[PDB]
Amino acid sequence: VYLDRKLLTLEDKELGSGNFGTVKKGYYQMKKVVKTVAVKILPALKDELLAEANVMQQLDNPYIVRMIGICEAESWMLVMEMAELGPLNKYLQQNRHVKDKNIIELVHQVSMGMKYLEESNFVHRDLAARNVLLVTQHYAKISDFGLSKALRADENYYKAKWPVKWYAPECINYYKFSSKSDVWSFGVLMWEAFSYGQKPYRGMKGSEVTAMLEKGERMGCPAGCPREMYDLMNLCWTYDVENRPGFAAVELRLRNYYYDVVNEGHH
Numbered sequence: 001v002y003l004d005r006k007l008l009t010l011e012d013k014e015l016g017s018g019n020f021g022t023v024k025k026g027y028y029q030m031k032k033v034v035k036t037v038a039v040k041i042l043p044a045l046k047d048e049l050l051a052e053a054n055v056m057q058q059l060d061n062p063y064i065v066r067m068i069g070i071c072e073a074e075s076w077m078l079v080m081e082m083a084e085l086g087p088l089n090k091y092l093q094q095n096r097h098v099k100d101k102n103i104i105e106l107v108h109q110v111s112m113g114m115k116y117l118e119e120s121n122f123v124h125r126d127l128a129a130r131n132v133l134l135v136t137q138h139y140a141k142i143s144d145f146g147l148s149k150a151l152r153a154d155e156n157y158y159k160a161k162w163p164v165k166w167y168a169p170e171c172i173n174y175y176k177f178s179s180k181s182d183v184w185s186f187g188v189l190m191w192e193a194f195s196y197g198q199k200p201y202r203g204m205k206g207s208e209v210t211a212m213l214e215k216g217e218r219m220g221c222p223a224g225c226p227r228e229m230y231d232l233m234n235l236c237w238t239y240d241v242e243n244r245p246g247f248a249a250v251e252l253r254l255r256n257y258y259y260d261v262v263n264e265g266h267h
């Protein structure tokens with residue numbers, strides 16, 4: 001898990017920054033091959049990066065960004081496998097030609113990764129289109145585990161600036177974060193994807209979003225988004241935690257609809 005700084009070569013330019021730290025492109029000499037990497041570079045900030053690394057170490061799924069390891073040099077560094085195409089929202093903003101079938105493919109991949117995360121009893125707590133990274137146009141991975149929590153053996157939730165527009169009502173009202181709250185976030189992520197990376201709740205303050213949702217109102221159907229996918233969004237935005245679907249149910253719906261669209265394409 002502990003990497004050798006002299007086997008790591010970093011670029012001068014920066015890729016971008018998340019909630020904390022800064023990410024640069026790099027190259028790491030493995031056992032034989034050289035691997036292209038994305039490297040998060042920086043007392044509280046040190047522990048946050050190590051907690052993020054601790055979460056990633058425990059995860060093993062094709063639809064989740066893999067950690068290569070950590071290194072304490074100029075600063076603490078978190079070395080991850082590179083996803084070359086970057087954040088999903090930014091990609092779709094630059095590529096409006098991307099077909100509806102392709103969007104379904106990508107959000108289904110996210111649902112598979114989240115089904116695994118749910119099974120593993122980890123809550124992501126920051127699921128948004130910005131935190132889905134593209135390996136290719138047809139391969140998405142979940143990233144940015146800086147706010148993620150391993151659930152206690154005896155509880156199905158974690159009790160806690162917040163990304164309010166992605167948060168379920170129980171997160172706001174009770175500070176409770178579960179796989180179900182991740183499902184709510186996933187609904188917002190779906191809306192973002194089908195809106196080609198547009199920000200949700202445009203022009204609204206966090207408090208106004210909370211007020212809107214309390215009234216039972218939800219964001220409208222994005223232009224060109226299939227009704228079946230908008231229906232799934234709304235299901236993810238079920239106010240009641242118990243009645244809201246888990247990721248097993250969400251993944252199955254997406255899987256089945258994706259196959260329907262693949263079938264229509266062949267006809």
Ligand SMILES: COc1ccc(Nc2nc(N3CC[C@H](NC(=O)c4ccc(C(=O)O)cc4)C3)nc3scnc23)cc1OC
Pocket residue numbers: 015016017018023038065080081082083084085086087089090130133143144
């Ligand atoms: C195409 O450019 C790219 C190519 C590869 C990558 N690749 C990668 N970037 C990042 N970071 C994690 C932290 C950085 N966040 C933002 O830059 C950002 C973006 C958008 C919003 C918003 O809309 O709110 C917020 C934050 C990006 N992490 C990993 S892990 C494996 N690959 C990457 C990134 C590119 O862009 C950063």
